């Protein structure tokens, strides 16, 4: 008798277990952004996956439908907020585009490296977890 | 206890039902008063929510209304005479609602002869006045007046003795009296 603590998982795993292209594709990302997991990519794919779903849906509603206008605007401003969605391409048909790398580019890991300050994605890992 | 649920009992389709829950006291019933005549005996039963019912068993007087005369009087209850539900009720003289009784006449006689100065069947100043005002209003009714000569008046219990401890009713009259006189002799 206490309200459920709610939860949910934050990743999804590839249906095809051993696809060699997807595996090379994944590894390259890991070796670019200092990841340790295929899950750190699995996670983002999943984040993207819903964002796109939302956007697909919104798109089916009439132009300037209240929900579409309200909930689309919200999602766009949330994405521009963190630097995933460019200023020009600010109208959700491009959030319908939007790649995994656009997301990985904005992790504190990378930002800590992008303006020197670490000079290797991995030096960037170690610094961060070390206060 | 006696239970008043519907959940025993077959369904309109004729289906047998499972036992769903045990008896609760809020569907309870109790046994009949089967109230009889004579010498007051009343027990109270504690009913739902605080609350009393009074279970008359044995009764000998009731309060009886002569509707057309607009008065009521308390009389002895002579006895039961006809019952539409069960003839055993008559044979045993059980008092219930709808029972046909005979009562006493003498309280109703005394009133009538004092109020009309007429006497059924067969000198003050203001009294004379009041009587002379009345009449053209004292012309009774054959089938009621004849009863007085026997000292006994047919009446229908209109209360519920098992419920209220009262055995009350009204004198039979007109059509309703016609009806039971017929039954009485056309079964006598």
């Amino acid at each position: 008798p206490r309200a459920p603590r709610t939860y949910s998982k934050t990743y999804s795993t590839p249906k095809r277990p051993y696809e060699s292209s997807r595996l090379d594709a994944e590894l390259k990302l890991a070796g670019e952004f200092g990841l340790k997991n295929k899950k750190e990519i699995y996670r983002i794919s999943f984040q993207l996956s819903k964002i796109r779903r939302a956007a697909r849906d919104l798109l089916t509603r009439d132009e300037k439908d209240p929900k579409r206008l309200f909930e689309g605007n919200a999602l766009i401003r949330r994405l521009v907020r963190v630097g995933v969605l460019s200023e020009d391409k600010k109208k959700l048909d491009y959030v319908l585009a939007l790649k995994v790398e656009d997301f990985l580019e904005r992790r504190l890991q990378t930002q800590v490296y992008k303006l020197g300050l670490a000079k290797s994605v991995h030096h960037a890992r170690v610094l961060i977890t070390q206060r | 206890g006696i239970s008043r649920d519907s959940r025993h009992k077959r369904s309109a389709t004729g289906a047998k039902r499972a036992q769903f829950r045990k008896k609760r006291k809020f569907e309870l019933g109790r046994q009949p008063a089967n109230t009889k005549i004579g010498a007051k005996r009343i027990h109270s039963v504690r009913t739902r929510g605080g609350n009393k019912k009074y279970r008359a068993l044995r009764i000998e007087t009731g309060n009886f209304s002569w509707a057309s005369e607009g008065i009521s009087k308390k009389t002895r209850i002579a006895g039961v005479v006809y019952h539409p539900s069960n003839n055993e009720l008559v044979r045993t003289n059980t008092l219930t609602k709808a029972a046909i009784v005979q009562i006493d006449a003498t309280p109703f006689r005394q009133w009538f002869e004092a109020h009309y100065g007429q006497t059924l069947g067969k000198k003050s100043k203001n009294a004379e006045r009041k009587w002379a005002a009345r009449a053209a209003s004292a012309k009774i009714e054959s089938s009621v007046e004849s009863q007085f000569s026997a000292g006994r008046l047919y009446a229908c219990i209109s209360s519920r003795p098992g419920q209220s401890g009262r055995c009350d009713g009204y004198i039979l009259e007109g059509e309703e009296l016609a009806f039971y006189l017929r039954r009485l002799t056309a079964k006598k």
Binding site: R2, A3, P66, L69, F70 | -
Partner: protein, 260 residues
Amino acid sequence: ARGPKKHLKRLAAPHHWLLDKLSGCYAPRPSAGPHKLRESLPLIVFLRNRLKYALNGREVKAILMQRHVKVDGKVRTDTTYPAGFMDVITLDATNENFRLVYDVKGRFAVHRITDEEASYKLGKVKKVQLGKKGVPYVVTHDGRTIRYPDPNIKVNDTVKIDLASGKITDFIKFDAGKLVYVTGGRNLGRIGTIVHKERHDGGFDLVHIKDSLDNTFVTRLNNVFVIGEQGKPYISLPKGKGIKLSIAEERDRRRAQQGL
């Protein structure tokens, strides 16, 4: 199940209280009183969750047992006493008066009112019967009985009540075009006039309502509480004035007041 239920599982609590999910398990159960369980605001809730005066429930009993808080004129010392819409809550110390009256989101708002207005209230008359010995009485939504009302007073009219005394000092008929507060349903909190009444013999008259933004909606009679004239309310309304804005309109307001 054998008798009167005596607890209230938090989650089964009404939502317009705005209790949190965790931190506990139960919510307070409104004592019996003038207002129904699910359309009430227990003192505990008001003294702690809105006014923030108490932190504990323990300190609510402490505040209350010194007879600090008094409702509708009278003192009241029940932690979970059922306060409700139109009632008046007073803190003599802190020199503060309150009226319980709704948001636009359907909640009970914290609403400071002046000391004078703090000495009367409005009552929807809920029934008008002939009582024993021929004395006619009215009954208002907060369960007051008032003997000898005005013969013109009928059910659904609102009524201005002294408080200091028991008596009525004015009433307002349920007519086409009178200021209305909506107390129940989705449109809980909305305010606006009355366009017209749908009849429907044998169940639920409908009251068509328009506000001061030329916006329209409907509720069951039941949910309609007369409170004055187009313009003239008979009590002060909370800020917002019961108008309800779209989520867009409310977004734009909130992000219009942005520059510190």
